[PDB]
């Protein structure tokens, strides 16, 4: 996770 899914 980084910002959705990444």
Do not use: I, N, S, T
Request: glycine content about 0%; aromatic content about 34%; proline content about 0%.
């Amino acid at each position: 996770a980084c910002r959705f899914f990444c």
